[PDB]
Ligand binder design. Structure first.
Ligand code: MG
Ligand code: MG
Ligand code: MG
Ligand code: MG
Ligand code: MG
Ligand code: MG
Ligand code: MG
Ligand code: MG
Ligand code: MG
Ligand code: MG
Ligand code: MG
Ligand code: MG
Ligand code: MG
Ligand code: MG
Ligand code: MG
Ligand code: MG
Ligand code: MG
Ligand code: MG
Ligand code: MG
Ligand code: MG
Ligand code: MG
Ligand code: MG
Ligand code: MG
Ligand code: MG
Ligand code: MG
Ligand code: MG
Ligand code: MG
Ligand code: MG
Ligand code: MG
Ligand code: MG
Ligand code: MG
Ligand code: MG
Ligand code: MG
Ligand code: MG
Ligand code: MG
Ligand code: MG
Ligand code: MG
Ligand code: MG
Ligand code: MG
Ligand code: MG
Ligand code: MG
Ligand code: MG
Ligand code: MG
Ligand code: MG
Ligand code: MG
Lengths: 116, 145, 204, 64
RNA sequence: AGGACGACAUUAGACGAAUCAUCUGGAAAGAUGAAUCAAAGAAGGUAAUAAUCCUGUAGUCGAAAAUGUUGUCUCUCUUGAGUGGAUCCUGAGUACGACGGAGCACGUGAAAUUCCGUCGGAAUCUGGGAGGACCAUCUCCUAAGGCUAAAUACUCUCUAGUGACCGAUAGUGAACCAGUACCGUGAGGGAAAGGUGAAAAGCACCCCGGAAGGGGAGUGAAAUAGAACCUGAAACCGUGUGCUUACAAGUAGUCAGAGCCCGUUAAUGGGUGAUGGCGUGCCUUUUGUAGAAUGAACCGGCGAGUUACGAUUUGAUGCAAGGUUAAGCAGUAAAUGUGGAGCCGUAGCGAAAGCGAGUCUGAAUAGGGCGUUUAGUAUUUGGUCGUAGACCCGAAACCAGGUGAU
RNA sequence: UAACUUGGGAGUCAGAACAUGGGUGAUAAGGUCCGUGUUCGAAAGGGAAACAGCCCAGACCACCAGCUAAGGUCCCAAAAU
RNA sequence: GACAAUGGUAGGAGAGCGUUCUAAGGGCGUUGAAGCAUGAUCGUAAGGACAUGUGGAGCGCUUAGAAGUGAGAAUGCCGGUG
């Protein structure tokens, strides 16, 4: 028996195009260039899930550095002091504390300085 | 079993492999042929036994022998096979054929001496091994060509 | 041992049927192979296509090998051309194959044994039909309390039984010699005359 | 159609009980002044077809 | 060579069972309920899907005429055996030979057996030919004259059917006014192009407009079915709008993210996106390609490891020292029954004679090679190979028969 | 924690750089030909600005968690003015 | 429960998705099938539902069978349109 091309092709291509929704011009319209872009999007997203952890740790560290400097202490010495004090609060929590309640952060800074 | 619940025996059936139907299969594109050369071509590949121009094995070796036009070959029966007939039986080529011991008689029945005869028989065959005749006689039977 | 009924449903007697035919444990592997074999043998196989040689025309090179700027082409009937010849495709052939005779016999026995163990085996004394009457045969089936799909087995060709059952959906009529795995398996119940049952027993 | 036997191979080998192929020996045609007594004596003895050669040639002698 | 009568068949036809109601709906065959026929539940049609509405189907019947095949009469022709071995006959430029070719599975070979050309050239039943040079013996035939049905091959065609064959780029090149249009001096090459609706009920009439086209009105279940008029994807072209954009360096996304606008298969929602991080398409081919190497304007359709028969291996199944049939015949184009010829296995070794669980080599009871000290076989899925175009497309060419000196 | 034997299926036979032992060349070549190792090929991630072959290191998937490698910590740009 | 592995081209091995057709069974459909369009849906992937609109008559599902069974590239063929 003969199997004509049928509907599968259009269904598959339409799925790719819908995933290409929002893209510029032909890239949200034509299957070949949409497919290519969706491939690039997948590769980029896989890479960027990992890069995002780097990025947010970097941000937290920058903010902690700024807070420590406000307390006359470098980021490096503050982290060394917290380690020697046995305090395991991670960078994200430290940043959020520094932002939200400065007195708590000042007490942590004094704990670090005492440990050093 | 029901025509709406048919099931082949486990391991009796396996889906055939289809090449050139996309990369995920592992046999897309070059379809398991690798890249280029004679062996990658439709209808490609050398003759069996061809050694790319090295003199083939079956030309560097020599011929031997001849075939005898009058070659004789016998249907063989051993004593272990004769062991199925009742003692006192007169075993003949016709009886061997009917009993199914011998299927194709070839140039005739030769009795050979493998295994042990455990019965007294009168064996008629076109030929006998020395050992076979000795065993047939020693068991109290007789043999005749 | 199986009861033998009259067409009115009352017990005419009892019959002994060899368990070596109706009492074996069905061999499903062999039965599947037999069913598949019969279904394959039923195929006509008359399908074809036109390859590039077969399609009309196409002899000449449609344009010169080099210089025109087009892809090189050798015939308008090449497979990538609209209207071109087909690559491979169906070609007339048989789908029938054989199995060993012992396995054929085992399949028939297995199907009969499956009926006997599912209680879809009814033995009747005889069919005393003198003229064909679909309505009488329908009544006989109803009195025997048979399911929709019934295979009726006669010792030999029974013209009137065949003609009476012929128009009834789901009712198939065969002889002891004509018994086959597809019919037995397709049926929900077998209605076999005493003489047919003995004959089948002899054969298998 | 049926596969065809390679007739030269069929004229040059014999199948043994275990399925091997007995063969005769090269360098046994002429120029015997140039081969030692031991060489000729030992070349007199038949051999088998090697495993690596069998891989290549087995289909040629499938009916043999 | 005819004739008479009869039968059957073909070429038109005839009869041929049995269903009503309601619901939805434009329409009922659908659903529901209750019935009926069946030697008829094949099929098509009918306003949707019908055994019972129609055409039909099973079954039965039917021919003025022509044709075909047959049977009996008629007609026509026509003796059939044995004994005897005196003589006679029993296919001549033949058989055969030489040289040169050809055909035989057989390539000139040790080349029988059979033909052609050239030249030469028998015997006559106590004869002649063959058994693969040749001779003898034996055995079997009787050339050099002719005829002969059936079993076999094929299908332009007619009749009745069938399909795990196509369904408008498929299937024929051709579903359609196709070997047409068109191209060519010619031989020759060779397309595209199906679908309103159940019914034509195919839009009276009014209005803008020269017309085309349109807006109403009407027909219709539907016109959003209005004429290449079922459905109506994408490329591509427009109109409107929520968010956004005129200091910015962009493989166009991705991850992060305010603001604004919405509100869903209700999910730790949807659209947009100031701004930040990261980031040189895809395929092919390559040591290595963002590559300035190849290919693709875009979208759609179409477009490439298949089948047959053998071989081998693996899995499965049956049977097992056994396993198994082929053609054929019967059967429904089936299964299947029958068919044991044949094939593989149960024993090998040896070039062979041959011997045999051993055999070959060898002077050897030596040594060494191959073997023994169980398992096969049939069918079949998968893998692979062989013969076939053998995964698909592509030469320049070669040969054969034609068409051309406008 | 492999190794070997038998059998079914392959692909590959253009290699590249870097380091090092050598020939050749001119103790030329991103040259060429051998030996030894690694990496690329067929390897993404971090470093070397960018940069197959160098340095670190081998990505089953998810996380806005932690420790480290090479390499780094004035600003671009995370961390010592 | 533990703890071990899971980069990958040629290529080998395995398990699957989807398409047409067939068989058997069981179902859906003018109270609206297929097809088409849209959606914020489900599954580890190929892919599967559901809702609504359009459409107007056919189509699923389960088990097994069989293949003209899956396209993005061939200066591929044809059509349409830039
Ligand atoms: Mg397609
Ligand atoms: Mg990390
Ligand atoms: Mg594979
Ligand atoms: Mg697989
Ligand atoms: Mg791979
Ligand atoms: Mg391969
Ligand atoms: Mg290639
Ligand atoms: Mg290469
Ligand atoms: Mg290769
Ligand atoms: Mg161009
Ligand atoms: Mg075609
Ligand atoms: Mg010699
Ligand atoms: Mg009528
Ligand atoms: Mg009605
Ligand atoms: Mg009627
Ligand atoms: Mg001659
Ligand atoms: Mg002669
Ligand atoms: Mg002669
Ligand atoms: Mg002779
Ligand atoms: Mg005679
Ligand atoms: Mg004839
Ligand atoms: Mg179709
Ligand atoms: Mg269409
Ligand atoms: Mg055409
Ligand atoms: Mg056409
Ligand atoms: Mg339309
Ligand atoms: Mg601005
Ligand atoms: Mg590709
Ligand atoms: Mg290069
Ligand atoms: Mg390029
Ligand atoms: Mg090139
Ligand atoms: Mg281009
Ligand atoms: Mg396209
Ligand atoms: Mg092939
Ligand atoms: Mg002139
Ligand atoms: Mg170099
Ligand atoms: Mg070089
Ligand atoms: Mg090296
Ligand atoms: Mg490479
Ligand atoms: Mg790298
Ligand atoms: Mg970098
Ligand atoms: Mg890993
Ligand atoms: Mg800093
Ligand atoms: Mg892996
Ligand atoms: Mg295809």
């Amino acid at each position: 028996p003969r199997v004509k091309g049928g509907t599968v092709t259009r269904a598959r291509r339409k799925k790719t195009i819908k995933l290409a929704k929002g893209y510029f011009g032909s890239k949200h319209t034509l299957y070949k260039v949409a497919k290519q872009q969706v491939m690039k999007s997948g590769q980029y997203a896989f890479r960027d899930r990992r890069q995002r952890k780097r990025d947010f740790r970097k941000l937290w560290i920058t903010r902690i550095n700024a807070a420590a400097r406000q307390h006359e202490m470098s980021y490096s010495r503050l982290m060394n002091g917290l380690k020697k004090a046995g305090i395991d609060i991670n960078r994200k929590m430290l940043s959020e504390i520094a932002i939200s309640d400065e007195k708590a952060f000042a007490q942590l800074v004094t704990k670090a300085k005492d440990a050093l | 079993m029901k025509l709406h619940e048919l099931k082949p025996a486990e391991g009796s059936r396996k889906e055939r492999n289809r090449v050139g139907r996309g990369v995920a299969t592992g046999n897309g594109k070059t379809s398991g042929r690798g890249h280029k050369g004679q062996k990658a071509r439709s209808g490609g590949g050398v003759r069996p036994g061809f050694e790319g121009g090295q003199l083939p094995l079956f030309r560097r070796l020599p011929k031997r022998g001849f075939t005898n036009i009058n070659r004789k070959e016998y249907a063989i029966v051993n004593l272990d096979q004769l062991n199925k007939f009742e003692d006192g039986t007169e075993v003949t080529p016709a009886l061997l054929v009917e009993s199914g011991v011998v299927k194709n008689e070839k140039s005739g029945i030769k009795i050979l001496g493998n295994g042990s005869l455990d019965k007294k028989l009168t064996v008629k065959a076109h030929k006998f091994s020395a050992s076979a005749a000795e065993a047939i006689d020693a068991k109290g039977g007789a043999h005749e060509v | 041992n199986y009861d033998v009924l009259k067409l009115d449903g009352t017990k005419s007697g009892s019959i002994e049927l060899s368990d070596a035919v109706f009492g074996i444990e069905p061999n499903n592997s062999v039965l599947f192979e037999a069913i598949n074999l019969q279904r394959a043998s039923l195929r006509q196989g008359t399908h074809a296509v036109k390859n590039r040689s077969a399609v009309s025309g196409g002899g000449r090179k449609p344009w010169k090998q080099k210089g025109t700027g087009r892809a090189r082409q050798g015939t308008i009937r090449a497979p990538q051309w609209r209207g071109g010849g087909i690559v491979f495709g169906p070609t007339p052939r048989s789908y029938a194959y054989k199995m060993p005779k012992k396995m054929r016999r085992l399949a028939l026995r297995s199907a009969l044994s499956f009926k006997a163990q599912e209680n879809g085996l009814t033995v009747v004394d005889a069919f005393n039909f003198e003229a064909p009457k679909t309505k009488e045969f329908k009544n006989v089936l109803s009195t025997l309390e048979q399911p929709k799909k019934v295979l009726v087995v006669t010792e030999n060709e029974d013209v009137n039984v065949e003609l009476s059952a012929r128009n009834i959906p789901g009712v198939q009529v065969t002889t002891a010699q004509g018994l086959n795995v597809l019919d037995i398996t397709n049926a929900d119940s077998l209605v076999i005359t005493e003489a047919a049952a003995k004959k089948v027993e002899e054969v298998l | 159609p049926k596969m065809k036997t390679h007739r030269g191979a069929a004229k040059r080998v014999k199948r043994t009980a275990s399925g091997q192929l007995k063969r005769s020996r090269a360098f046994t045609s002429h120029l015997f002044a140039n081969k030692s007594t031991k060489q000729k004596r030992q070349l007199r003895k038949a051999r088998l077809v090697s495993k690596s050669d069998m891989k290549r040639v087995k289909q040629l002698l499938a009916y043999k």
